[PDB]
């Protein structure tokens, strides 16, 4: 969609996607209907996988470490 | 959340997440607020990364090949 993030992940490491409290309801739905959420494996380097996530601004992307 | 899928992905290979037409609006929002979407790198084997996706039933998970 709009926002962009690439992060390295190893085995057992993960990401959680959620909705922002501040944005309204119906507009996130429509975004997610128009622009989907795109997940991409860009490179694999050794024990590290680099994962791209492209999602609308209303979506919060959070590494599981937190 | 509820649904579960693990798929192998190599460099440049990706996945698109969207909302199902058939499910209503407000209940998917709440799911995505209660159960988020969980993305996990389970194993890295060579040129292949295995990616787990855990999401509510209202979310459609689609390999980019299609």
> Which range marks the domain in which residue B26 is found?
1-66
What does this entry list as its resolution, in Å?
A: 2.2
**Residue A17 to residue B33, Cβ atoms within 8 A:** no
Residue with tokens 């922002």: A20
Experimental method: X-ray
A17 vs B: CB within 8 A:
yes
Contact A22, A59 (CB under 8 A): no
Four-residue CA torsion sign, A57, A1, A45, B49:
positive
Q: What are the tokens at A29?
A: 């739905």
Q: What are the tokens at B10?
A: 């190599």
CB-count burial class (<10 Å; 0-12, 13-18, 19+) for A9: buried
What's the rounded Cα separation, in Å, for the pair B38 and A9?
A: 13
**CATH at A32:** 2.60.40.4380
**Residue A19 to residue B39, Cβ atoms within 8 A:** no
Contact B55, B33 (CB under 8 A): no
Contact A36, B55 (CB under 8 A): no
Enumerate the β-bridge partners of residue B16: A38, B62
Residue with tokens 């190893």: A10
- Closest-CA residue to A48 (of A16, A13, A2): A13
Q: What are the tokens at B18?
A: 């969207």
Interface test with B, best of A37, A46, A54, A56 (most B CBs within 10 A): A37
What's the rounded Cα separation, in Å, for the pair A40 and A32?
A: 17
What's the rounded Cα separation, in Å, for the pair B36 and B34?
A: 6
In chain B, the number of structural domains is 1
Residue A66 CB partners (closer than 8 Å, separation 6+): none
> Measured at the alpha carbon of residue B12, what is the angle toward residues B47 and B32, in degrees to the nearest 5?
105
């Amino acid at each position: 969609a709009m926002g962009f993030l690439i992060l390295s992940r190893r085995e057992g490491e993960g990401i959680t996607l959620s909705l922002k409290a501040d944005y309204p309801a119906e507009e996130l739905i429509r975004q997610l209907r128009e622009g989907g959420i795109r997940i991409l494996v860009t490179d694999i380097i050794g024990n590290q996988a680099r994962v791209g996530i492209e999602a609308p601004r209303g979506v919060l992307i959070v590494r599981d470490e937190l």
